[PDB]
Homo-oligomer: A and B are copies of this chain.
């Protein structure tokens, strides 16, 4: 049972983890065949069709219902009206070039949704027309649709109808970008019957509906679901390289707020950190409150996904042909409010994920906040000639600012339209387009951040190795200069100085008298001299008399030693292996560093940060980040660590 208003079935689709939903979406996306029957279309199938060998097939089980309502319209009744309908809706503007044309991917999404939302049998259109649109998809012959003109999608959908009917102004684009007439398009696509002459109701069936707004919203939500998981995992890698306290993911904290999005985000981060070799070694809000921040954004993206998946399996033309009751049912299912509402809400959530990413990036490159990493994550021997990610950090502010502007809603700008017949209207596709632009900016930020984290990973590797070399050298010199002499007792304290000091505060000039290493090593020898008692009053047992000798020997030896150790690390033979290799997050570093050839950035080379960003951004846009992202979590059993 008894679920008469369908709240219960809706609620059941919101059970289980978000991650498991994303895993399912990815497996669906990679299937070779999209089979349409009017009721099983997912956003991942829309995304598959809009991107790339994937083919569409129509279920033969749907044919009888489609033929029933098509036959009914013909029996309930020359063609001039459907010809006029398409003519006057062809009111869009293309101009020259592509700036005012709906993108290729989005047109294919619209075509797929358009077919699926006519298969239920209530629309009164011939199955043969659905088969023609299916051929246009499978042969990658794409009608040209205007970008604007809809308040949600009569005007843009009429250019699909105009191709099917061979209007003289109709155009399509071939697989390689050639502009085609409708005759050429039919022949390349395998539509052999000549142009369609629209029967009554068929024009309305084609142009009435929300397929353009809901098709682009599907593409948007497929990417937004994956980027949410990427933001969760990158929060954990950020925590790793920042050396943050992992207790911020403790399950008790998140259990006590009940919010499931927050509980999952914390458990995912806790999984990354529980298998981290960096943790085996308070924080500011962008680290410590990242699960609280991300949780509601994930819940909104997930709810929005469910709204759009219902919309792309709905019957949204008018009137409906009800052969069972022998009548047409007039209504308003063309009103695309689920699209506008879900896209406005999702856009605000994307902006919040981007704002967190900006704040995390900002902590990461700031030497006041990043626990010993170099300012700007600079990588070369000479900080005066390496400003690291400073330009990228400026770019990240520009991304975040424009993202916050894009977060404003579209659906509060409704005009009373069409001689005030359409005195409310959804603006669904306009909102989908703005959320799509927001997703692209989030990809720019995710790319820049991810390359930043890999730089930070390599800097921690450099840090561990150079610190070991400084310790060894200080120990060598201390043994040589202070040995039996009362000065052999402060070797352990000299080493504690090295363990306590930040390598990157001095390693570019380790023996400079104005840097903390030499100063604090001298301070330690002075402190031991002051506690040396009467032994200090003898020039043979004086620690103070050893200072100048100690500093000369360190100056003669430490720079060459640091440089040898660094040359060795740059040749792939470090004394201490890179700890990322033993971390659960390794797949993402390995993909970025090895598979894509992204380079450690240093002012000693000519390579700019953007040249490396390009490699990650292009891979990200092809979905190549999906596999290493999921691989970092593949040993997670879907539960938080016990707190009892």
Question: Which of B10, B303, B423 is within 8 Å of A363, CB to CB?
Answer: B423
Per-residue CB contact flags for chain A residues 270-314 toward chain B (1 = under 8 Å, else 0) read 000000000000101110111111011101100100010011011
Interface contact B413-A405, CB-CB below 8 Å:
yes
Interface contact B284-A420, CB-CB below 8 Å:
yes
Q: How far is the CB of A5 from chain B (nearest CB, A)?
A: 5
Instruction: Pick from A91-99, A464-472, A485-493, A574-582 the stretch touching chain B.
Output: A91-99
Question: Which of B303, B320, B411, B422 is within 8 Å of A285, CB to CB?
Answer: B422
Interface contact B148-A398, CB-CB below 8 Å:
yes
Instruction: Pick from A61-69, A324-332, A592-600, A626-634 the stretch touching chain B.
Output: A324-332
Question: Which of B351, B398, B611, B617 is within 8 Å of A149, CB to CB?
Answer: B398
Q: CA of A146 to CA of B392 in the docked complex: distance in angstroms?
A: 13
The answer to the question of A644 belonging to the interface, with a C-beta cut-off of 8 Å to chain B, is yes
Q: CA of A613 to CA of B418 in the docked complex: distance in angstroms?
A: 19
Interface contact A424-B259, CB-CB below 8 Å:
no
The answer to the question of A358 belonging to the interface, with a C-beta cut-off of 8 Å to chain B, is yes
Instruction: Pick from A24-32, A224-232, A521-529 the stretch touching chain B.
Output: A521-529
Question: Which of B87, B267, B342 is within 8 Å of A5, CB to CB?
Answer: B267
Given A286-B423, A348-B345: A402 and B148 interface contact (C-beta under 8 Å): yes
Interface contact A412-B610, CB-CB below 8 Å:
no
The answer to the question of A483 belonging to the interface, with a C-beta cut-off of 8 Å to chain B, is no
Per-residue CB contact flags for chain A residues 437-468 toward chain B (1 = under 8 Å, else 0) read 00011001001100000000000000000000
Q: CA of A398 to CA of B89 in the docked complex: distance in angstroms?
A: 14
Interface contact B4-A639, CB-CB below 8 Å:
yes
List residues of chain B with CB within 8 A of the CB of A311: 257, 259
The answer to the question of A56 belonging to the interface, with a C-beta cut-off of 8 Å to chain B, is no
Question: Which of B292, B338, B391 is within 8 Å of A335, CB to CB?
Answer: B292
List residues of chain B with CB within 8 A of the CB of A388: 88
Which A92-122 residues have C-beta < 8 A from chain B? 92-96, 99-100, 120, 122
Interface contact A285-B401, CB-CB below 8 Å:
no
Given A84-B603, A149-B398, A307-B296: A348 and B424 interface contact (C-beta under 8 Å): no
The answer to the question of A245 belonging to the interface, with a C-beta cut-off of 8 Å to chain B, is yes
Interface contact A91-B609, CB-CB below 8 Å:
yes
List residues of chain B with CB within 8 A of the CB of A139: none
Which A253-278 residues have C-beta < 8 A from chain B? 253-260, 263-264, 267
Interface contact A285-B6, CB-CB below 8 Å:
no
Interface contact A285-B95, CB-CB below 8 Å:
no
The answer to the question of A568 belonging to the interface, with a C-beta cut-off of 8 Å to chain B, is no
Size of A's binding interface in residues, CB under 8 A: 191
Interface contact A393-B408, CB-CB below 8 Å:
no
The answer to the question of A247 belonging to the interface, with a C-beta cut-off of 8 Å to chain B, is yes
Given A88-B390, A91-B610, A320-B253: A405 and B408 interface contact (C-beta under 8 Å): yes
Instruction: Pick from A14-22, A44-52, A188-196, A500-508 the stretch touching chain B.
Output: A14-22
Interface contact A394-B91, CB-CB below 8 Å:
yes
Question: Which of B267, B341, B369 is within 8 Å of A352, CB to CB?
Answer: B341
Which A334-377 residues have C-beta < 8 A from chain B? 334-335, 337-338, 341-342, 344-345, 348-349, 351-352, 355-356, 358-359, 362-363, 365-366, 368-369, 375
The answer to the question of A400 belonging to the interface, with a C-beta cut-off of 8 Å to chain B, is yes
Q: CA of A17 to CA of B11 in the docked complex: distance in angstroms?
A: 12
Which A591-644 residues have C-beta < 8 A from chain B? 603, 606-611, 613-614, 617-618, 621, 638-640, 643-644
Can you name the residue of chain B whose Cβ is closest to the Cβ of A263?
B5
List residues of chain B with CB within 8 A of the CB of A638: 4-5
Q: CA of A337 to CA of B263 in the docked complex: distance in angstroms?
A: 14
Interface contact B282-A330, CB-CB below 8 Å:
yes
The answer to the question of A414 belonging to the interface, with a C-beta cut-off of 8 Å to chain B, is yes
The answer to the question of A407 belonging to the interface, with a C-beta cut-off of 8 Å to chain B, is yes
Interface contact B348-A344, CB-CB below 8 Å:
yes
The answer to the question of A385 belonging to the interface, with a C-beta cut-off of 8 Å to chain B, is yes
The answer to the question of A126 belonging to the interface, with a C-beta cut-off of 8 Å to chain B, is no
The answer to the question of A155 belonging to the interface, with a C-beta cut-off of 8 Å to chain B, is yes
List residues of chain B with CB within 8 A of the CB of A84: 385-387, 603
Q: How far is the CB of A490 from chain B (nearest CB, A)?
A: 15
Q: How far is the CB of A148 from chain B (nearest CB, A)?
A: 6
Interface contact A422-B404, CB-CB below 8 Å:
no
Q: CA of A524 to CA of B300 in the docked complex: distance in angstroms?
A: 62
Q: CA of A282 to CA of B332 in the docked complex: distance in angstroms?
A: 10
Question: Which of B299, B332, B430, B617 is within 8 Å of A248, CB to CB?
Answer: B332
Given A286-B423, A351-B412, 15 more contacts at CB 8 Å?
Answer: A4-B638, A4-B640, A7-B15, A7-B18, A11-B14, A90-B391, A90-B611, A148-B399, A149-B398, A150-B394, A248-B330, A250-B329, A285-B335, A285-B423, A300-B345
Give 15 A-B contacts (CB < 8 Å), ordered by A residue: A7-B17, A81-B385, A99-B440, A122-B256, A150-B394, A286-B423, A324-B644, A325-B644, A348-B411, A369-B420, A400-B415, A402-B413, A408-B409, A412-B413, A529-B544
Top 5 closest pairs, chain A to chain B, by CB: A289-B332, A90-B608, A91-B391, A397-B417, A4-B639
